From Swiss-Prot, chain A:
Tissues in which the protein is found: Preferentially expressed in skeletal muscle. Lower levels in pancreas, placenta, and heart.
UniProt superkingdom: Eukaryota
Parent sequence residues shown: 216 to 434 of 434
Result of changing F173A: Reduced transforming ability
Compartment annotation: Nucleus
Protein name: Transcriptional enhancer factor TEF-3
Lineage: Eukaryota, Metazoa, Chordata, Craniata, Vertebrata
Role description: Transcription factor which plays a key role in the Hippo signaling pathway, a pathway involved in organ size control and tumor suppression by restricting proliferation and promoting apoptosis. The core of this pathway is composed of a kinase cascade wherein MST1/MST2, in complex with its regulatory protein SAV1, phosphorylates and activates LATS1/2 in complex with its regulatory protein MOB1, which in turn phosphorylates and inactivates YAP1 oncoprotein and WWTR1/TAZ.
Phenotype when changing D51A: Reduced transforming ability
Curated annotation (Swiss-Prot), chain B:
Function text: Transcriptional regulator with dual roles as a coactivator and corepressor. Critical downstream regulatory target in the Hippo signaling pathway, crucial for organ size control and tumor suppression by restricting proliferation and promoting apoptosis. The Hippo signaling pathway core involves a kinase cascade featuring STK3/MST2 and STK4/MST1, along with its regulatory partner SAV1, which phosphorylates and activates LATS1/2 in complex with their regulatory protein, MOB1. This activation leads to the phosphorylation and inactivation of the YAP1 oncoprotein and WWTR1/TAZ.
Tissue specificity: Increased expression seen in some liver and prostate cancers. Isoforms lacking the transactivation domain found in striatal neurons of patients with Huntington disease (at protein level).
Subcellular location: Cytoplasm; Nucleus; Cell junction, Tight junction; Cell membrane
UniProt lineage: Eukaryota, Metazoa, Chordata, Craniata, Vertebrata
Protein name: Transcriptional coactivator YAP1
Gene coding for it: YAP1
Range of the intact protein held here: 60 to 99 of 504
Record's subunit section: Part of a complex when phosphorylated that contains DSG3, PKP1, YAP1 and YWHAG; the complex is required for localization of DSG3 and YAP1 to the cell membrane in keratinocytes. Binds to the SH3 domain of the YES kinase. Binds to WBP1 and WBP2. Binds, in vitro, through the WW1 domain, to neural isoforms of ENAH that contain the PPSY motif. The phosphorylated form interacts with YWHAB. Interacts (via WW domains) with LATS1 (via PPxY motif 2). Interacts with LATS2. Interacts with TEAD1, TEAD2, TEAD3 and TEAD4. Interacts with TP73. Interacts with RUNX1. Interacts with HCK.
Conditions for induction: Induced in the hours following cyclic mechanical strain in keratinocytes.
Domain comment in the entry: The first coiled-coil region mediates most of the interaction with TEAD transcription factors.
Amino acid sequence: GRSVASSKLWMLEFSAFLEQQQDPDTYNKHLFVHIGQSSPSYSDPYLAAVDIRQIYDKFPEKKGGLKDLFERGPSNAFFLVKFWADLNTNSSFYGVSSQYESPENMIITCSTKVCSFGKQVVEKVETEYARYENGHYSYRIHRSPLCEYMINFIHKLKHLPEKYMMNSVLENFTILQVVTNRDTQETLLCIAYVFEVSASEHGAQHHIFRLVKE
Amino acid sequence: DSETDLEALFNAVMNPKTANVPQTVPMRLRKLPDSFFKPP
Ligand SMILES: *C(=O)CCCCCCCCCCCCC
């Protein structure tokens, strides 16, 4: 399906999952959200735009915050992803995986901030190194453990008696992902994530928007 | 109080009479594309 790309970095894959081990040879994986999983990943200009001012309140502000990051640019690195998450699932491993491609050989930092009412609750920071691949360079975060806060959050979501209550909680839950060139501090990708519960028979869904000034 | 209080966040929806969280504008009331609310 549709993925996210700036001029310098393309995120081909993104997934959050729960993996259950029945026996040493049998593994069951449930995907909560996914990009570039069901069908080959792609990027094109056909996606819609969202006024960034409409979402500033849902993410950390001040120095280093979404507004500060957006103003510094480049503007083509900023995206909003709306996830419809598949929560229908019941040894366990909660994980997150992502993959990136760049024409450039960089050392990159991936910062993921979980936010409640626009306030940072927890941050995970990962440093990723390049591997040569067909003239370009690939970066991979493989099976990174989901933080306990997110595990706790998912548990509490599932224990809500009504699904509409889950949506009410998700109203004020966001994630901001900032992928940076470690040396230059250039914003390679900045992705704002918003969530709803999926009711689709196809499971989890997503829609990607460009973040713009209006 | 704390805005990042996990129990408070879930208490607000489970027991609305005891809700103690910031008040916000629901996304559905904001200037956003229709595709933001309708899955593909
Ligand atoms: C803790 O380390 C924060 C890291 C968060 C990684 C993003 C995972 C996306 C969560 C999707 C789960 C769906 C919950 C509605």
